[PDB]
Design a protein around this ligand. Structure first.
Ligand SMILES: */C=C\C(=O)[C@H](C*)N[C@H](O)[C@H](O)COP(=O)(O)O
Ligand SMILES: */C=C\C(=O)[C@H](C*)N[C@H](O)[C@H](O)COP(=O)(O)O
Ligand SMILES: */C=C\C(=O)[C@H](C*)N[C@H](O)[C@H](O)COP(=O)(O)O
Ligand SMILES: */C=C\C(=O)[C@H](C*)N[C@H](O)[C@H](O)COP(=O)(O)O
Ligand SMILES: */C=C\C(=O)[C@H](C*)N[C@H](O)[C@H](O)COP(=O)(O)O
Ligand SMILES: O=P(O)(O)OC[C@H]1O[C@@H](O)[C@H](O)[C@@H]1O
Ligand SMILES: O=P(O)(O)OC[C@H]1O[C@@H](O)[C@H](O)[C@@H]1O
Ligand SMILES: O=P(O)(O)OC[C@H]1O[C@@H](O)[C@H](O)[C@@H]1O
Ligand SMILES: O=P(O)(O)OC[C@H]1O[C@@H](O)[C@H](O)[C@@H]1O
Ligand SMILES: O=P(O)(O)OC[C@H]1O[C@@H](O)[C@H](O)[C@@H]1O
Lengths: 266, 272, 274, 262, 262
């Protein structure tokens, strides 16, 4: 099925770090550091937060400059519900569209119908019900969100523990009780049952928002994420490598010490 | 081809019919002779349950068997909501349908019976499209859209039939992209919302139940888009049940014939 | 340890029905119907609820008459926190004390310190936190409670699903999260971990409250209970001696619908609940 | 006569109406392919920032804009200010927009637009408002977002609201339409006309927050007949890009071309 | 193994743990007689003033402090940030303080401290919190005031609260302890251990607002085993004065001597 193929593409990012970049030079630095993919954008979440204004899809010209500067997959953000921005991004030839909460919401009631697209989408969530709803709309990959731009991991921890804890609860739940659980999640029952049978989210799950240090990144992996997004926490060429290392060797405290030592200001 | 689809097909056979509550073999015969498509075996009518109080449970298997042996039309029986053992007993009796019913005392306030675990088809109630689709996903092969049971008052059945059928009509022309949020707002499975959208009607047979007291009430439910009606109190708590039973059966069969509606309503006696 | 021995003792009741009785003849009917034990009392819960007044421990005389009329274990109820009522019951030589919510509370803030007694106690609960607190106080067996005297199974279903649902959540829970779980249950961490390791309550768990029909009793078994208490459902019904047998056979054959049909068929009038 | 005004407005279908503040901007708008210009002295984003009372523009600056292009010229009048409307009509312009972005002149009543020879455009946020404006004599409806913010969210909300109600109305049980008209506080006859047509009885444009070619094409894919743009443009390149996006709204390749490096 | 960690922490009894930000401060602390140092990059008073997210310090600055003294070296990790704890343990320090003065990393769960070889210090404001921290594996408890304010009032409140509850527990009817443990939301077995010991089952220090020798001696007279000081000191004279006050807390003459002209 076309969806299962998109899900397989995102599965190739497992164990990786996706980095926000604002030009070709940052793109190369992320790639040279070992980022599994780059997120092309005009201003990072820490800047979106402090500057205000409306934040939209980046200029196709800048996205193309990044796409041609690197060989790892390139993602780009579209406003939630802005299915025309996603049509443009898909026409550029990028590899992923991230329907992103850090951009200004375009549709308060509806997300993009992602099954209408050929390229895979990333969507955000804060709980299992939201994740399953995004998946049913066609998301091939899920970002479990903290507070973007704050450098503060607390909400990412909260939401990762919430998503993974609900999955664990679902695992040994009385089958007769799953119907009500799906109602309370306001989630599609078939996806709830798929999650119960897998014992994990039916697509790749990365943590995103507030990942500032190698310890933060390894913490997300130890709590069960498949990878991390980092935006502000890097841009710096040395900090990118350390976070990549922290994610690859998240259970090695010796490696975590080495990359954290003398790393500079976060 | 699927087991659920076969159960759905069984309930299709009841389209255009009247299902009557009966409390003994004699009333079962009156129901069948008047032309009911099925009988609902129970120990107290919903009007008696409403007045008397107490806990209302599955009927004694003995009395159900006496009803099944007295008629050739299908026999249904009620189980309390969530009481899957009552349903196991009912199925082991060999009746044709189990009605997981709100008029008996709730056994489980948070969960319904997992009806897929049974081979015989279930009827469940609803008051809105979300509830209907949830019951269907749990395995109901047929849906009662409920009014007030035992009151003789059609107002809630009209409200809920209009609500269920109105939301189905809204679904028909709805932007496909908005259906995901609609399913969320309904707390209903998205696949079943889409099936209702594609069908333009409920994915299973939809009867009205609750407060149907007169031939005009019964024909009103059919004109509003129901496939049939349940009647409990309106027949046997009235003056002449056998006459009123036929009158209601005729009204459902000929719901668009005002001449027929007059003839069966004329001189019919006291309603409940 | 002494507590482990009392816990082991009550394992013998698994698969059984414990029946409330108010005289020696009722006890003889319970035993002959196949009850695993009798609960001796002066008023059944349906009568306590309707009549009012203060409900206390029964006269030791009537308890002795019941104990000598049967060979199966005899239980008797003490008011919650009334440790002297329990001292008296232990001196009578009965087999179990049930510290029971259906009697009038004697102590609103503290239960009986059940470790001070040689005989095992049954306590009630409505959730996993309560069950683990009762066990820590020394209960050797737990009643997961519905509404006594109503013939309505809804609260027992609610509470059985709650206790067992929390145990299932606990089984798979991240170890690092159990400390907070114990805090939010207000339950002793060591018992929470024991429950997590066992995947069930550390003591025998029966359902009690509102079991009126064989179908109700088998339902409690299919929901995971080890047995049921019946008080009002038997002797406040049409034919108690036949209904007692039917409920015993429903608990033994809870997964057999043909047997449930047979014992339920023509069983006469069940209790008039509320 | 109303149907004549309604038919005139149908000529704008598929177009971009740009706000302009001088003859030169008017000419750039026209040359970029705008279907009409909206003459004013303050752009909506400057109306928001500066504050103050905002009114009909000087007839002198409106005449200059009118003389400087051949595409229709619109101008705004305060809501309920039927005298500003009389002056604009006497100027000889083509459309009057009774506009919520000027200071409200009458909080309880709109202009009785049937008293005028030239067509009017009114705003709305929901189907009940659109039909009331139409019954008052609006020949064209602007489904409004937040003017001057560059944020499309409310325009998306209001466009989805108006069109979703129309879709609901289309296959509603006729017997239930009387209550629907009451709940909308809308004239029953216009509700039935809308139900029978399956769309709004006049041209419907989106307005408010349309900032990028992607926004404009989004409004078209959601079912609008066209879009207004005010702050979004002033520049001849961005104006042409939005015109192109509205003309070719289902073509992602064209949307990339006009958006690239903009 | 937990009792080994508990016994190690008992060596600190009667001591002052000072916060330090470099090797030199560490040496001044040690020479003034501190029983241990707490390595960090921002003092609590500067954490309050500056704001921002506060985290585990760079392992490089912690190693330098560790190399610069022979008394135990502690370092802080964010609450629930078990990975920061893994890094600190890999550094080879002596104690990890799971500290409320860093930004909370996990609002619902603390570090499962039993998974670590080295002892942990946790904070508390009441006996229920202290016992929960201990059940999680804290070998030492800080009864907290307001960090970085120099105001002793909350430390006095929390010390009186913990010790008063212990005194109440000591002669409580055994039958009532089950409900007491429930009300504390604390493990019943630790509640009984506390009742039988007549004191907290681990070393208890005061921390937060200890500004003067008089404050430090007050904490000792209220029943603490020692005190933490962060902002209060940085200077070698004030550090020695607080060490002296803790060592000789019942001697008013010594308290005058070290306080005079300070
Ligand atoms: C919630 C996060 C997002 O929506 C965006 C799209 N993810 C970002 O690209 C960053 O990776 C997360 O932000 P950060 O600056 O790391 O806090
Ligand atoms: C809501 C109705 C029901 O749950 C029951 C099961 N249906 C009854 O059998 C009757 O047909 C409806 O009750 P009535 O006495 O007709 O009002
Ligand atoms: C909650 C139940 C109790 O506390 C008592 C002690 N159990 C009774 O003996 C009955 O078995 C339960 O009451 P019932 O009449 O069956 O509802
Ligand atoms: C709601 C919009 C209006 O009332 C005005 C009359 N329309 C304007 O001319 C603009 O086209 C919309 O404002 P914008 O600056 O695009 O947000
Ligand atoms: C509550 C105090 C803490 O969490 C930290 C870890 N303790 C500090 O090291 C200081 O000793 C207390 O702060 P102070 O500046 O003395 O108020
Ligand atoms: O509840 P649903 O509609 O599934 O999703 C809610 C999220 O969608 C967006 O508006 C926001 O990001 C919000 O958090
Ligand atoms: O909301 P759900 O769980 O679908 O069903 C609620 C209905 O189920 C039963 O408890 C009652 O009949 C109630 O009306
Ligand atoms: O565990 P705790 O909360 O102390 O006990 C609660 C129960 O104890 C008695 O008061 C009542 O029966 C109540 O339900
Ligand atoms: O149709 P009604 O409700 O009268 O008009 C509402 C609008 O009329 C004007 O005052 C404002 O623009 C407001 O939004
Ligand atoms: O014992 P619990 O209540 O879980 O812990 C409370 C403390 O845990 C941390 O979040 C804060 O320091 C808070 O004061």
């Amino acid at each position: 099925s076309p969806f299962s193929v998109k899900v397989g593409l995102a599965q190739m990012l497992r164990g990786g770090v996706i980095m926000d970049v604002v030009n070709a030079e940052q793109a190369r630095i992320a790639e040279e550091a070992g980022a599994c993919a780059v997120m092309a954008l005009e201003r990072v979440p820490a800047d979106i937060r402090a500057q205000g204004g409306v934040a939209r899809m980046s200029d196709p010209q800048m996205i193309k400059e990044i796409k041609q500067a690197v060989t790892i997959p390139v993602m780009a953000k579209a406003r939630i519900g802005h299915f025309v921005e996603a049509q443009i991004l898909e026409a550029i030839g990028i590899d992923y569209i991230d329907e992103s909460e850090v951009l200004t919401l375009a549709d308060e009631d509806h997300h993009i119908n992602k099954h209408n697209f050929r390229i895979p989408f990333v969507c955000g969530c804060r709980n299992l019900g939201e994740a399953l709803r995004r998946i049913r709309e066609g998301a091939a990959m899920i970002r479990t969100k903290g507070e973007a731009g704050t450098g503060n991991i607390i909400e990412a921890v909260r939401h990762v523990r919430s998503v993974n804890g609900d999955i664990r609860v679902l695992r040994n739940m009385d089958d007769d009780e799953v119907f009500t659980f799906a109602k309370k999640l306001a989630a599609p029952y078939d996806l709830v049952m798929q999650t119960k049978q897998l014992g994990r989210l039916p697509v790749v799950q990365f943590a995103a928002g507030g990942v500032a240090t190698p310890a933060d990144a390894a913490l997300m992996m130890q709590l069960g994420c498949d990878g991390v997004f980092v935006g502000s926490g890097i841009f710096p060429a040395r900090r990118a490598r350390a976070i990549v290392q922290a994610v690859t060797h998240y259970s090695d405290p010796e490696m975590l010490v080495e990359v954290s030592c003398g790393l500079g200001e976060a």
